Each structure stands twice: as structure tokens, then as C-alpha cells.
Amino acid sequence: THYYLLP
Amino acid sequence: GEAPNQALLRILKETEFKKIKVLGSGAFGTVYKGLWIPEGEKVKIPVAIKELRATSPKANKEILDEAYVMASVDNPHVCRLLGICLTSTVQLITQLMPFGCLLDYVREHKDNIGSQYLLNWCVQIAKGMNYLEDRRLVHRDLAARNVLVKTPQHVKITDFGRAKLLGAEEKEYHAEGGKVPIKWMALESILHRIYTHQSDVWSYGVTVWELMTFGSKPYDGIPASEISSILEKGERLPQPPICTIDVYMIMVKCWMIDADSRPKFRELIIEFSKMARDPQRYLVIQGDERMHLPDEDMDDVVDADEYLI
């Protein structure tokens, strides 16, 4: 749960 | 600018290795604990066999360069691919790292880890990354979760799924959009999708901070939606309790915005090995002077690091 959406 | 990659990719038979146990399972398939027995070589090599279920051609396509990358690297502190097996479901065979993930190990053994080991682990990762830099390679996913424990005294870098090679003219790698480990990334990596060897130094800094806090979550409890604003405002990860200012001074330098102001991996090797010779002086742990850390047949077994082709 530490892979995130990059804007 | 580059030299030919004459690395050898070994194709293995399914009848060449024995599957003892299942380490873990997922939608990505199941990892097997097993022994690799080269046909008529009288050797048994403890292996980790990771091979997948519902394959999409996208999935297959570069589970394969991870294999391409791992087959090209050769260092005492880097996981080397032993070979692959082209079954109905493609087989990838790597060296068995019994004690598993380093992040889980420091969480599990936080009571019996001394300053000597922590400083050693920092040196070995620094050495591994330095080898990767020599190979003109950028890992792009360096974290405590991606350092594996062969023995408590021997760790290797892994997870090359995001790794990229750099051209001779190239100095920076410009990536494309996707889900990324924000809280390990450099500022330029978060903002401009720009990666470099120095961006790994940042990620290397966070990895150390994880170890010194025995597996704490970096920037825990704060949303990743703007870690990058905070990094701009000047804030960094706090100083771990066991860390002298010396050690923490080193972490901070890795988190400099000017990537050129960050330490090279070859220098991190020097400094940590400098501190590794007098551990007590640089890491204050209680009961430090009293701590000690250390499956199927076993007559012909050889470790993969001793089996050369």
C-alpha cells in the first residue's frame, strides 16, 4: 500500500 | 559508448530442479523453495523458484528483463539470476535467501541486532549500489523491502523491475507515468520524473533510516499526496534514537535537493566502513555488547555463490 498515483 | 553485454542467460530444464516448499503465493503466482540439480554435476543448489499462474503477454514480456538485468549483474552484494525455465508458465530461478527480506528481519529481530550488523548492512548495500553505478545502472526502487538476507552477515540488492540502463551521453533518465513508491523517491523524481544515480542515494538514505529505526515507516501517518511540498519546505525524516549525529549527518546529506551535493556510493562505502570498525562509537544500542545472530539430503549441497559457470 505504498505505491502511489503520480499527478 | 557502451561495451557488449556478453553475459550468459542459462535455460534450465524443469526436470533439473526439485521443489520442496512454497514460500509465498499470489495472483502473480507462487514462489517455491527448492534445490537446483544440474544434470550430472553432483551438486544441489538451494534456490527460489518464482513462477506465475493467467499470463498476459505484457506480464510475461518483462518479468523477462528483470531476468535480463539480473543475468547481467555479477557482485557479492547483488542477487544473481541462476537461470530461467521456459515452461507453459515461464520459470525464473534465483539464489535462495533463507532469512528473507531485510525489512522483516529487523522488525523480527529488533531485540538482538547490534550496531556492528547495522553498520555492516549499510556498507554492503553501498557496495552493491556502487557496482550498479559502475554498470551504468539506476535501480529506481531501492528500499529496505528490496534488500535480501542470505546470512545475517551477507545481504544482496534485488527487485530490478524498475531498473534502467544509461547511455554514455545520458546522465538523467526521463520516465513515464505509473504508480511509484513516493516516500522513497528523490524530489526531482517526484516532481519531474527524473532519475539518476544520485536519486538512488536519496533512496539509499531512506533505506538506512528504516534500518536504524528497526523497520519504521518513513513519513508514517502523513499522506503522500504532498511529501514533495514538505521536502521543499525543508523537512526530513527524524533522527533515529540509536543514531549519533555522525550517522544521521550522513543520511541528511543524501536528502540534499542539489543531487550533486549528495554523496557518491563509493564515499558511503568509505564512511560507513570507517564507522564499522568502532560500532559502539557511532550507534548507541542498549545491550549492544551482548547481542548475537545466527529445511530438508544435505551432503552434496553447494551455495550458488560457490557455483560458477
- All structural domains of chain B with their residue ranges: 1-96, 97-291
Indicate if the alpha-carbon torsion angle B272, B155, B208, B69 is positive or negative.
Answer: positive
Whether residue B31 is annotated as binding a ligand: the answer is yes
Supply the DSSP symbol for B289: G
State the cell numbers at B48.
Answer: 527460489
Chain B residue numbers with beta carbons less than 8 Å from the beta carbon of A5 are 179
- Catalytic residue flag (residue B141): yes
Cα angle B133, B138, B142 (rounded to 5 degrees) comes to 105
CB contact under 8 A, A4 and B193: no
Contact B95, B173 (CB under 8 A): no
Contacts for B184-191 with beta carbons within 8 Å, 24 or more apart?
Answer: B184/B141, B184/B142, B184/B143, B184/B218, B186/B259, B187/B228, B187/B231, B187/B232, B187/B257, B188/B259, B190/A6, B190/B227, B190/B228, B190/B231, B191/B228
Homologous superfamily, domain B97-291? Transferase(Phosphotransferase) domain 1 (1.10.510.10)
Q: How far apart are CA B167 and CA B176, in angstroms?
A: 18
CB pairs under 8 A between A and B: 20
Q: What size, in residues, is chain A?
A: 7
B129 closest CA partner among B271, B292, B269:
B269
Answer whether A6 sits within 8 Å of B182, measured CB to CB.
yes
- SS3 state at B143: coil
Q: Which residue has the cell 551482548?
A: B290
Resolution in A: 3.2
Which of A3, A4, A5 best tests the B interface by mutation, with the highest count of B CBs <10 A?
Answer: A4
Tell me the one-letter amino acid at B261: S
Q: Which long-range contacts (CB under 8 A, 24 or more apart) does B181-184 make?
A: B181/A2, B181/A3, B181/A4, B181/B141, B181/B143, B182/A2, B182/A4, B182/A6, B182/B224, B182/B227, B182/B228, B183/A2, B183/B217, B183/B218, B183/B219, B183/B224, B183/B227, B184/B141, B184/B142, B184/B143, B184/B218
Contact A6 B178 (CB under 8 A): yes
Is there a contact between B297 and B224 (Cβ–Cβ < 8 Å)? no
Q: Which of residues 172-211 of B touch A (CB under 8 A)?
A: 177-183, 190, 193
Torsion from C-alpha of B18, B22, B24, B25, nearest 10 degrees? 90
CATH topology of domain B1-96: Phosphorylase Kinase; domain 1 (3.30.200)
